[PDB]
């Protein structure tokens, strides 16, 4: 019935934040995005960059067009703003958890728009701001977004974790809890 | 920050059927979530969706240079990129790791595999259990790996069997009561 594979070059521009994104998606996973600050291709896995190249400059040119189209489309809509859609948040591990055996906490932030969040990992209520990582905003088929944040950790009986999420669709920050 | 937001999205989509034998190209334009125009290779011109795209439909469809560009995209864009990416995407294979433990529910935790296509089967004394199976379904980890937790309601040898494109033959993990 259905295709074997989809490749999507997904772009967005958001006003008034002036946030652009340009990324390639293969069956739901990111191949790469362009870092709009460094103006650079960022490969989701390092080895992709040994297998292929992308000229970041072409993506910056598309983003300029997207922002001009946006302003044109903002006027054509009579300034119909976006309706905030608050995210669903789930915390899981990469693998079965064993005490003192390295693992990774995944904070999955799903089905939300617009593509702006503040995400903090909390270990025993304290921010973890080194040795964490995140994805850009990944496109959904319903044209909402998802995103992933990661925390490598050593499972312990003594520690508790929260993924804290702020988004304009929520009334307060959302804490999603994990503990052994 | 209370100020109203305005979002433009563009999705250049390549759909591949039977490798590259059949390819569909969509250029899709979105205001917030609202697809307002698209180019469907199968259609061969721009069509206004939520008719905020009316201007763009006409103006773009009146630039016959653009159309031959877009009509060619299934070759110049889609089939090209498929070729570039094939080796590390279409052909990417990473083995599942399988762990069985009591949560009773007997958990078959299947982790770190690519691609997403997988069959996870529970056997009790060598017979497939077709009831009492509580599954997560496929979980995308966002790092080109998947997991799934497939739990069997139990009250003997229990074996979890995994089939996956990465494997030459089924992976089995046994739990003896």
């Amino acid at each position: 019935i259905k295709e074997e594979h989809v490749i999507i070059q997904a772009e967005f521009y958001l006003n008034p934040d002036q946030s652009g994104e340009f990324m390639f998606d293969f069956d739901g996973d990111e191949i790469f995005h362009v870092d709009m600050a460094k103006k650079e291709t960022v490969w989701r896995l390092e080895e992709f960059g040994r297998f292929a190249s992308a000229e970041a400059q072409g993506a910056l040119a598309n983003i300029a067009v997207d922002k001009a189209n946006l302003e044109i489309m903002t006027k054509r809509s009579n300034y119909t703003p976006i309706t905030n859609v608050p995210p669903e948040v789930t915390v899981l591990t990469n693998s079965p958890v064993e005490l003192r055996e390295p693992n990774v906490l995944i904070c999955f932030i799903d089905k939300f728009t617009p593509p702006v969040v503040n995400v903090t990992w909390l270990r025993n209520g304290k921010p973890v701001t080194t040795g964490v990582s995140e994805t850009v905003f990944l496109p959904r088929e319903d044209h909402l977004f998802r995103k992933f944040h990661y925390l490598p950790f050593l499972p312990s009986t003594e520690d508790v974790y929260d993924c804290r999420v702020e988004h304009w669709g929520l009334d307060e920050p959302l804490l999603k809890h994990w503990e052994f | 920050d209370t100020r109203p937001r305005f979002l433009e999205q563009v999705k250049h989509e390549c759909h591949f059927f039977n490798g590259t034998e059949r390819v569909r190209f969509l250029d899709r334009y979105f205001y917030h979530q609202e697809e307002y125009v698209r180019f469907d290779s199968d259609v061969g011109e721009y069509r206004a969706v939520t008719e905020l795209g009316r201007p763009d439909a006409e103006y773009w469809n009146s630039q016959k240079d653009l159309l031959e560009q877009k009509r060619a995209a299934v070759d110049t864009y889609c089939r090209h990129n498929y070729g570039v990416g094939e080796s590390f995407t279409v052909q990417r294979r990473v083995y599942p790791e399988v762990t069985v433990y009591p949560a009773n529910l007997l958990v078959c935790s299947v982790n770190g595999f690519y691609p997403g296509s997988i069959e996870v089967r529970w056997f009790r004394n060598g017979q497939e259990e077709k009831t009492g199976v509580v599954s997560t379904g496929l979980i995308q980890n966002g790092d080109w790996t998947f997991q799934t937790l497939v739990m069997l309601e139990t009250v003997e040898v229990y074996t979890c069997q995994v089939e996956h494109p990465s494997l030459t033959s089924p992976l089995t993990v046994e739990w003896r009561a």
Binding site: - | V10, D27, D56, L66
Partner: peptide
């Protein structure tokens, strides 16, 4: 080998 990015047209004011 290089991925090709697809360009888009400017819209109608």
């Amino acid at each position: 080998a290089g991925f090709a990015g697809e360009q888009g047209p400017a819209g109608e004011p």
